[PDB]
Amino acid sequence: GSHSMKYFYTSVSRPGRGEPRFISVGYVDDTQFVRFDSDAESPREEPRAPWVEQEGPEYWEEATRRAKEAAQTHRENLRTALRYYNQSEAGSHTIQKMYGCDLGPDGRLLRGYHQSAYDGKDYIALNGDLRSWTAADMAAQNTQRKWEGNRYAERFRAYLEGECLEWLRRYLENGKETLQRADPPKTHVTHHPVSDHEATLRCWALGFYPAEITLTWQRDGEEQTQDTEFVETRPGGDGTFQKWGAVVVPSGEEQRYTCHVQHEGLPEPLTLRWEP
């Protein structure tokens, strides 16, 4: 259905360590396909997915060029930032920027992304209208005015509705079996006694893609939040994701609990119960 392409930039100044470090990563949905590290032994755009690895040399040369350009841009923005917040050059700071596009079902731009934060806090972000900007503080308003003066939202929007979507479609075509694939989660319920009166029920969902998934517990068919623990969705390391949800249950009440898991790859929602 809906797909997306996102780029994540992280620039960290290193007073004394010389130039700031720039790290860029590219994602199609939940699949990383490219990377760039200024601290790599030979800085260049690298393939992290099989379906982008066979792109001609021009792709990698241009990609590298743009990556380095972005790096320098973030350096200049780091200096400008030091000057906006009146900070010392002996201190370390961070600039993060995520930007991308969401290809909808009708092959048209569904949503656009262009947001940047300074030192882990919102700095300036492109609004849903794709016309206006939102500045977090008085320092970001300078940038906002600068970008309003040079029609940046318009131009970047031209990028969004054009090149971005084009390349996204190209990737989706070349990586058909991988990107347009929806792997269902291999699930199972485990039992772990805490004492002689209580026992933990843990619902496992493994090796699923994409990362989006819903996992809950129900007592007597009623939603349960009390005495429950859900861990953050974690990567498997092979391109898949994992997640489990546990609940503390009185001994003898086990068969009254059910784990519910919904995922894109699931033909039908799952209703699981402890199967000793």
């Binding site: 780029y7 860029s24 590219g26 755009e45 792709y59 241009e62 990609a63 743009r66 990556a67 350009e69 972005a70 841009t73 200049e76 923005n77 400008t80 930032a81 906006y84 930007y99 700095y123 300036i124 300078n142 940038t143 600068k146 940046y152 131009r155 970047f156 990028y159 090149e163 971005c164 390349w167």
Partner: peptide, 9 residues
């Protein structure tokens, strides 16, 4: 692909 252009704060 990546975006090209000047983006100064």
């Amino acid at each position: 692909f990546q975006w090209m252009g000047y983006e100064l704060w």
